[PDB]
Design an enzyme around this catalytic site. Sequence first.
Site, PDB file in Angstrom:
ATOM      1  N   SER A  96      -8.671   5.783   3.462  1.00 17.97           N
ATOM      2  CA  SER A  96      -9.387   5.284   4.632  1.00 17.97           C
ATOM      3  C   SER A  96      -8.515   4.423   5.554  1.00 17.97           C
ATOM      4  O   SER A  96      -8.822   4.323   6.732  1.00 17.97           O
ATOM      5  CB  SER A  96     -10.606   4.492   4.204  1.00 17.97           C
ATOM      6  OG  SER A  96     -10.275   3.442   3.288  1.00 17.97           O
ATOM      7  N   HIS A 101      -3.154   0.622  -0.985  1.00 12.80           N
ATOM      8  CA  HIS A 101      -4.101  -0.304  -1.584  1.00 12.80           C
ATOM      9  C   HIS A 101      -4.554   0.255  -2.930  1.00 12.80           C
ATOM     10  O   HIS A 101      -4.846   1.454  -3.042  1.00 12.80           O
ATOM     11  CB  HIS A 101      -5.293  -0.572  -0.651  1.00 12.80           C
ATOM     12  CG  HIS A 101      -5.961   0.650  -0.075  1.00 12.80           C
ATOM     13  ND1 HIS A 101      -5.404   1.405   0.945  1.00 12.80           N
ATOM     14  CD2 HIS A 101      -7.173   1.212  -0.326  1.00 12.80           C
ATOM     15  CE1 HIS A 101      -6.231   2.406   1.268  1.00 12.80           C
ATOM     16  NE2 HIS A 101      -7.319   2.314   0.498  1.00 12.80           N
TER      17      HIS A 101
END
Lengths: 115, 111
Positions: A96, A101
């Site tokens: 996204s 991450h």
Amino acid sequence: RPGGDTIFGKIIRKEIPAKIIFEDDRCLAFHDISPQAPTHFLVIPKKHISQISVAEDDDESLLGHLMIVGKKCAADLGLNKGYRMVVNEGSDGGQSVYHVHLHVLGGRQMHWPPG
Amino acid sequence: DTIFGKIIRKEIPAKIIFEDDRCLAFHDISPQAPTHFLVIPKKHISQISVAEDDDESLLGHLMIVGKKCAADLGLNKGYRMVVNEGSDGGQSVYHVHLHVLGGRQMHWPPG
Ligand SMILES: O=C(NO)c1ccc(-c2nc3ccccc3c3ccccc23)cc1
């Protein structure tokens, strides 16, 4: 503006607020704003690497540090029954934000397959 | 010992994708995507919760190896990397392993 201008870069520089769990010179752990489990947080490098597919060989220890910090944070939050760590790459992976991450999810039974 | 120890010791078959002096990558025997492989350390770390600080580089190495193998297996539309810990994480084998899944749209949530 080091850390990039993705939303995560802005979080690293404290330009956009977040619920911080842990911070050091290499990384930042903070709660995810659309949680998919009772506990759902993110560990990100302060160095902007857009995606795991373009990580450099000498980013190894930094990527390891993400996992070590993830596991320490999970323990400090009391995820005694375990958790799932996820890195998403690209479109099929459902990435996204183009800043690497590590998702850490727990406080419920996680299912298989992992999406 | 685990079945993964057996695999590292080459006592049972596995379709090995890559090996070096500190890790092994191989196809998962119960794949959940068109491509589904594992990257494991040769050192016996039972679970990520008990990994040591000194293991950082090694754990990072699993991910770099995973991303290189993914490219070499033609996963150009992307993929998902997963580490399970404990019962809630669904960890199936008490030997640290990095899953790498692709060749299809992965969904949210991730289980
Ligand atoms: O559009 C998206 N995906 O398709 C998307 C991508 C990032 C954020 C997003 N994530 C976060 C995760 C943790 C903490 C804070 C945030 C945050 C704060 C402000 C504005 C956006 C975000 C929200 C939505």
